[PDB]
Amino acid sequence: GFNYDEAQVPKYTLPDPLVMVDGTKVTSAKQWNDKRRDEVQQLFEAYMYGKVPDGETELIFTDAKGERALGGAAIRKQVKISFGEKEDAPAMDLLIYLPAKVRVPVFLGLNFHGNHTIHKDKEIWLTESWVRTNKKFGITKNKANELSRGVAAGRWQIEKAIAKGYGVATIYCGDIDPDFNFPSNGIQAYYYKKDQTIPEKGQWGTIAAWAFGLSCAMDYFETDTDIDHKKVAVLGHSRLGKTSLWAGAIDTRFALTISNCSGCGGAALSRRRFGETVRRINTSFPHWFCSRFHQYNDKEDKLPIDQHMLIALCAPRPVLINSATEDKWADPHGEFLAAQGADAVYRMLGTGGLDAKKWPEPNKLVKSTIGYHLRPGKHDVTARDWDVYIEFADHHM
């Protein structure tokens, strides 16, 4: 069964970010940047998240207008980003609030229930993608409707961000790939996956698909002269924080990466086997990871990576790991210990790494280049978490 007792955590050895797979010591920044970093990213692709397929991405952006809002406090934009010219064209909606002088720094993340859930604003478009039922937010049908406008606003503290000089941007994860809570292995998809350059075992990832979505949103930001595309912080909660951590890791355009209660296969060290384990996450969510990751059920000690090496991928750029005290499922101590295990790479690249020896006491940000915060209470995104995000962003961005 699952363990929530620190005293029962097994002994383990972590692979060393600073040792090449061939056994050569990594002794310089140059060597990390030229050889090891890409090697570590290729291990994550092949064993855990899967690789984004090659061949060009033909994004099309709507209008990008800009309307006063939050009377007004802010400009709102909604942009439809389509993948190609045909019917239908996967498409996703990007909702952006910016403060109403210079190119605006922005927090960008995926949401769980639709753009219209992040603020009451009646102008937000209602997604047509499938949505999950959710008791806490009173969502009882799988087609989005206006009754849930604003219900997840607590997780997106727009008014708070705006007052501090940041914009907020968001996309519903289900416009990218729905993450159904029921099994669907249709035959067409079974057959499409065989005729592929990447073999099935190494193909993306729900998580990797969602992370690609976020990089497509950075492509848009590059075209928008009201947004500072060099100061975008990518953030995410829970399964969407596993995503944000990966996206920020591999897309070096993001200035700052935030993982909020991302737990197993996100910030938490897999070898600790505390709370959620690899077998459990792959059993519950067989499409989230590449199928090669399934071979490491109950065998976390044979993984060629662990999540300290993911956090190290973000180096030199700032990364914040936020945990919640009651969120034992996520292994908050393991999330801290992963951050600690990237410290040497970040020091090699000339930054402060993680300024903490012991797992810190709750509710005080460690604000070093690798940041860590342990927030009292439940697995969630709260007003306090946003204060932390902004305190970190104000220091680094």
Author numbering: 4 to 103, 106 to 402
Task: Provide text from the study.
The CAZymes family 15 carbohydrate esterases (CE15s) include members with glucuronoyl esterase activity that are predicted to act on the ester linkages between the 4-O-methyl-glucuronoyl substitutions on xylan of hemicellulose and the aromatic alcohol of lignin as their natural substrate; the so-called lignin-carbohydrate-complex (LCC). To discover the real conformation of these non-homologous regions, as well as determine the catalytic site residues, we have solved the crystal structure of MZ0003 to 1.9 Å. This represents the first structure of a bacterial CE15 enzyme, and is the third and most divergent CE15 structure reported. In summary, the deeper, positively charged substrate binding pocket which is formed by a novel sub-domain in MZ0003 is likely responsible for its broader substrate specificity relative to fungal homologs, and indicates diversity of activity may exist among unexplored clades of CE15 enzymes.
